[PDB]
Design a protein around this ligand. Structure first.
Ligand SMILES: Nc1nc2c(ncn2[C@@H]2O[C@H](COP(=O)(O)OP(=O)(O)OP(=O)(O)O)[C@@H](O)[C@H]2O)c(=O)[nH]1
Ligand SMILES: Nc1nc2c(ncn2[C@@H]2O[C@H](COP(=O)(O)OP(=O)(O)OP(=O)(O)O)[C@@H](O)[C@H]2O)c(=O)[nH]1
Ligand SMILES: [Mg+2]
Ligand SMILES: [Mg+2]
Lengths: 163, 585, 142, 141, 163
């Protein structure tokens, strides 16, 4: 059992990830206004995953799911150099809360498809993940439309449940 | 955990077996629970207490894996426990015993000969056919050793793998070459039993092995002439166990050879005279000596002497020796056939002996003693002895009457007369399997069925409950009914055949509960034939077929309805297939 | 070939089985029950042998304990009784005043004595000295 | 001496399997009154040993005594010091006033391969004429 | 104390691993029909290791050692691409049992000697280790004939001894 949240910007593939983790296929997904949950069942831990869409009118309501959260997924796009700043703003906005203080971080460099897509390292330092405090943050470069690195992030995450 | 003898002492205090099972399952759980603890300490004794319960007859399937752990132990005592219950809890069909195969193979290469002695023990006692296939090169390797502690063991283990795998002995033909000069007797004994085994399986091995016949003729003569050793000597007789095995090897060798049979002839003439017949041991020596002489193309002076040996053995009051002597002539029935026939009254005497086995050997040898000369007189003893059999021998005699009668019957009538006598007096003792044989020989008989079927009819009015008797009769009434009721289509002067009580006596079987339903199977068969074999009163028998179409036996419900349509629709096609059956062998 | 060996009490209480032939436990419990019944239903002048179902079944009483073998129907019989007696001698050897209650107790070595004497259903040591020597050495090995 | 009948062959077997030639502490049976082996009960016992049989002329020893005495204490409730006899020099007379048996001097596979003591006597005047008191006057006052 | 089972295909070097962890040398070993056990003492944990040979006539009997097992080793051969299907079949057949439900899995990628020999990753995805349930599986690429990676698998195994 683990409460999982999939936060991030819009068009992040986060529902593309979620139905790849639960089902295994890339379903044609609308821009999800509300949220999503599928209990992904993997590595002796049932990951209860609260995927929530990342459009503008939703981001204030993000605080309502930050309770009993054992772990984050802050999905980033590797193909959004223009939005990495507000994502870095979002991250520094969101992590700084007393609620959601003991949940580790697993960042997905989604949409590794282009030379526009960066690696984990540049995305780490554009976000400044070394500036974090009280964090088991761990970026994990993933390809949602091919399942690549997805189970490996879940692998790292399942290590990070027990102590 | 308590010890073994502490458990046994508690078990010896048990009165009721049900109460004893309470004491079983008391300790058995602790044995199980210790097994859940994966103990190595008391795993010696918990298995030992378990094997006692196994000897007490209790389900000890569970601890068999721990035995594999005890074989795969390192302490010698845990192995000493471990190899034992492997011979106890496991067999070939245990199907979990295959894990020994690695463990034994490591322990055929253990430093201690006693550990390797345990490995040759367990594989020699219960080694599986595939385990024999998986250990074959190692056993001959431990048969190529010099350790006579192991050479005595790898030899008999090689017998086992040749016993279990008969197609494996050809790699032991080189293994056995020229180790026949062993100073030890035990290794030399096991080699003989191996060469007993090697000569037993393949006739192709006989050519290599009949060569060394005079080698052991010397060594057996060494055993007679070494009249004492502090070991091997029982009652002043030196190593009799080896001596018989040589004779048995000399029995299976030279049995169709003559030169080896003459190469062994001297020591046969020796030990037939140079034995001490006082104790049980020298009789056991001389018994195989008799059997060795009979089975080889021996000297005629041996065999004449050998019957004179047996004439002594017929007259010893030891029932052992009487069992020995009766078995002896039971062996050499055909060989030296008429020197047996002069001991005939001794055999008829042992019919009146008060032992089962002695009466068993005498009855069966009397079945073997019947030639075409003693056929008339001895059967009158035997038909009397059939009356004076035990009910266990009544089944045994009445068949063995039928066996020798089919051989050497001087008449066909008297052949019928004795069989008809036995069928009246055996009844529930004569086997149903001889009934198609008796049915065959009386239709192999072609001439006396008016003689037969009347005498068949004259006794079945006495009784029906003798089921193999009335198995015989109903086929005869169906087939040779014309010879029973003859020219009596209508009523005549009253002869004993009356063609209605003829039909009633079969009908009496059909309602009687003492009917094996193949009595009733033969009976409707006889009813339907006497629709053709009798022209006297048919279609009253159609009524009996028609009322039987609702019967509770399945085939006898089939049999009646399948008859009845011929009785109702194809009355002319009834007789169109009721020709008599052909006669075969 | 000795097919099996049975040692059962005056009450028929089996103190030893040794199946040199592989037949299952129900058949083991059937056959053992029958022959104990056969031998105990058999007198003292009944030739010490039973022709039991193609097995010239050897019995030889020595004490309250009874004795049983199943030899192949081509082999010797009095020697088969002597095999028992040689084994009786080896039990008389390794124990001395060989006696009933440690048959109940120290049966584990009586199997081992049989293991030093008969493996496969046949004799491996025709001496009576060398076999009990070897089991003492393995006892001296402990 | 009723419950002394059910172990009369059973404990004597353990005596006879004991050679005439874990655990710590001593339990006491709850609420059962205890008393020494009294005179008339020893008269009740010496006749119980006279009548039930299997004791007279048996090889007496100390190991058999201690098997017997504790069994009396645990099944009948009697202090197991009653089967005391006079020592080595002389006839082993009982110190017990009422015990009419004096002690005069007189499996099989546990033997190795090649090999490299008292008895009772009934004396019905031991209950009255204390002969052990004649062997030990200064101890009995 | 830890009961260890060495299940897997034949010719896997599983006895080669077993006498390299225990003894330290590559002994000339027959194809083992039965089993072997050597209590390997490493990371101050006495690994009681039940090496069982992997021929056809033994694989049904594997169920008998599946009681009180705290740890598996499923050795595969890296030089057997043709046998990875039945090794995948063997694994899914075996792991699906109520007995042996709480024992971790340590897959060895033995016989790393060839370009034929694969790494841990292709062997992970041929066997489909990401399809697993209630598992602390972890593949460890090992070289039996050189001792490489063997005790490091035993290093990770002693971590998963306690919780
Ligand atoms: N090429 C490529 N495109 C991807 C990949 N992952 C996601 N995408 C694209 O990103 C788009 C957004 O994915 P979705 O999951 O459907 O939408 P979302 O990110 O969940 O946004 P919301 O629905 O508003 O929560 C998809 O339509 C995909 O085409 C990837 O790994 N490779
Ligand atoms: N080149 C190379 N060969 C190896 C290596 N490990 C094992 N082998 C080979 O694989 C063969 C099988 O090894 P064994 O341990 O003897 O046999 P097994 O795998 O245990 O099979 P069973 O005995 O039936 O249980 C050995 O003969 C080795 O030659 C390795 O790391 N490198
Ligand atoms: Mg979405
Ligand atoms: Mg191996």
């Amino acid at each position: 059992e683990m409460r999982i949240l999939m936060v991030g910007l819009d068009a992040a593939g986060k529902t593309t990830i979620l139905y790849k983790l639960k089902l295994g296929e890339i379903v044609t997904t609308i821009p999800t206004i509300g949220f999503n949950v599928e209990t992904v069942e993997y590595k002796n831990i049932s990951f209860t995953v609260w995927d929530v869409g990342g459009l503008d009118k939703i981001r204030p309501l993000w605080r309502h799911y930050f309770q009993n959260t054992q772990g984050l997924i802050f999905v980033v796009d590797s193909n959004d150099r223009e939005r990495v700043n507000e994502a870095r703003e979002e991250l520094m906005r969101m992590l700084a809360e007393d609620e959601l203080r003991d949940a580790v971080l697993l960042v997905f460099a989604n949409k590794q498809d282009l030379p526009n897509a960066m690696n984990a390292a540049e995305i780490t330092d554009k976000l400044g993940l070394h500036s974090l405090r009280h964090r088991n943050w761990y970026i994990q470069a993933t390809c949602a439309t091919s399942g690549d690195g997805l189970y490996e992030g879940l692998d790292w995450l399942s290590n990070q449940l027990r102590n | 955990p308590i010890r073994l003898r502490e458990l046994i002492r508690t078990i010896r205090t048990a009165r009721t077996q049900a109460e004893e099972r309470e004491m079983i399952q008391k300790e058995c759980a602790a044995i199980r629970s210790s097994f859940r603890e994966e103990d190595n300490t008391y795993r010696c004794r918990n298995v030992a207490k378990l094997l006692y319960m196994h000897m007490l007859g209790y389900p000890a399937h569970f601890g068999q894996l721990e035995c594999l752990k005890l074989i795969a132990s390192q302490k010698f005592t845990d192995k000493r426990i471990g190899y034992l219950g492997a011979m106890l809890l496991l067999d070939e069909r245990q199907d979990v015993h295959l894990l020994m195969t690695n463990c034994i193979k490591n322990d055929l290469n253990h430093s201690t000969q006693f550990v390797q002695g345990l490995a040759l023990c367990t594989l020699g006692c219960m080694g599986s056919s595939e385990m024999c296939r998986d250990l074959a090169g190692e056993v001959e390797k431990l048969l190529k050793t010099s350790n006579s502690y192991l050479r005595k063991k790898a030899a008999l283990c090689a017998v086992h793998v040749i016993r279990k795998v008969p197609e494996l002995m050809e790699m032991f033909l080189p293994a056995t070459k020229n180790l026949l000069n062993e100073k030890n007797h035990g290794v030399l004994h096991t080699s003989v039993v191996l060469l007993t085994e090697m000569c037993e399986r393949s006739p192709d091995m006989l050519a290599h092995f009949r060569k060394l016949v005079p080698q052991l003729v010397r060594i057996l003569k060494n055993l007679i002439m070494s009249g004492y050793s502090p070991e091997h000597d029982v009652s002043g007789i030196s190593d009799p166990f080896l001596q018989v095995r040589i004779l048995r090897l000399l029995r299976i060798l030279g049995r169709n050879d003559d030169d080896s049979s003459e190469a062994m002839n001297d020591i046969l003439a020796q030990v037939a005279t140079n034995t001490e017949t006082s104790k049980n041991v020298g009789n056991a020596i001389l018994y195989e000596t008799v059997l060795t002489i009979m089975d080889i193309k021996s000297e005629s002076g041996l065999r004449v002497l050998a019957i004179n040996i047996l004439g002594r053995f017929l007259l010893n009051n030891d029932k052992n020796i009487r069992y020995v002597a009766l078995t002896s002539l039971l062996k050499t029935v055909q060989t030296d056939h008429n020197a047996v026939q002069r001991h005939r009254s001794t055999i008829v005497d042992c019919l009146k002996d008060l032992d089962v086995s002695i009466k068993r050997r005498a009855m069966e040898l009397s079945f073997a003693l019947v030639n075409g000369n003693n056929i008339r007189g001895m059967m009158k003893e035997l038909l009397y002895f059939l009356d004076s059999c035990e009910p266990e021998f009544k089944a045994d005699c009445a068949s063995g009457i039928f066996l020798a009668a089919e051989k050497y019957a001087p008449s066909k009538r008297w052949h019928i007369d004795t069989i008809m006598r036995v069928l009246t007096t055996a009844g529930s003792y004569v086997r149903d399997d001889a009934v198609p044989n008796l049915i065959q020989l009386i239709t192999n008989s072609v001439e006396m069925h008016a003689y037969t079927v009347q005498r068949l009819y004259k006794a079945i009015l006495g009784d029906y409950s003798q089921q193999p008797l009335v198995q015989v009769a109903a086929w005869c009434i169906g087939e040779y009914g014309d010879l029973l009721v003859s020219g009596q289509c209508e009523e005549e002067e009253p002869i004993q055949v009356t063609e209605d009580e003829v039909l009633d006596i079969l009908e009496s079987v059909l309602i009687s509960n003492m009917s094996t339903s193949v009595t009733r199977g033969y009976a409707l068969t006889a009813i339907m034939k006497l629709s053709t074999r009798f022209t006297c009163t048919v279609n009253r028998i159609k009524k009996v077929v028609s009322i039987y179409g609702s019967s509770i036996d399945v085939e006898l419900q089939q049999r009646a309805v399948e008859y009845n349509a011929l009785f109702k629709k194809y009355d002319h096609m009834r007789s169109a297939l009721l020709e008599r059956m052909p006669v075969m062998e | 070939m000795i097919h099996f060996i049975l040692l059962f009490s005056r009450q028929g209480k089996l103190r030893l089985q040794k199946w040199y032939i592989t037949l299952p436990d129900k058949e083991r419990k059937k056959i053992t029950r029958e022959i104990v019944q056969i031998i105990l239903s058999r007198g003292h002048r009944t030739s010490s042998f039973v022709d039991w179902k193609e097995l010239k079944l050897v019995y030889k009483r020595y004490a309250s304990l009874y004795f049983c073998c199943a030899i192949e129907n081509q082999d010797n019989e009095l020697l088969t009784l002597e095999i028992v007696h040689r084994y009786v001698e080896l039990l008389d050897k390794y124990f001395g005043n060989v006696c009933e209650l440690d048959i109940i107790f120290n049966f584990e070595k009586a199997y081992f004595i049989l293991d030093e004497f008969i493996i496969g259903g046949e004799i491996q040591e025709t001496s009576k000295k060398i076999a009990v020597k070897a089991i003492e050495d393995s006892d001296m090995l402990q | 001496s009723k419950s002394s009948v059910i172990g009369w062959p059973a404990v004597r077997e353990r005596m006879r399997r004991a050679e005439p030639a874990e655990e710590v502490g001593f339990p006491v049976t709850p609420q059962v009154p205890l008393r020494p082996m009294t005179y008339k009960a020893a008269v009740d016992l010496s006749h119980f040993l006279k009548e039930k049989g299997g004791l007279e002329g048996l090889i007496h020893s100390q190991r058999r005594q201690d098997i017997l005495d504790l069994w009396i204490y645990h099944t009948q409730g009697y202090f197991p010091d009653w089967q005391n006899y006079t020592p080595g020099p002389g006839v082993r007379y009982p110190l017990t006033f009422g015990w009419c048996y004096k002690l005069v001097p007189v499996k099989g596979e546990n033997t190795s391969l090649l090999h490299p003591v008292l008895e009772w006597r009934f004396d019905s005047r031991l209950a009255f004429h204390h002969v052990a008191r004649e062997l030990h006057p200064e101890y009995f006052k």
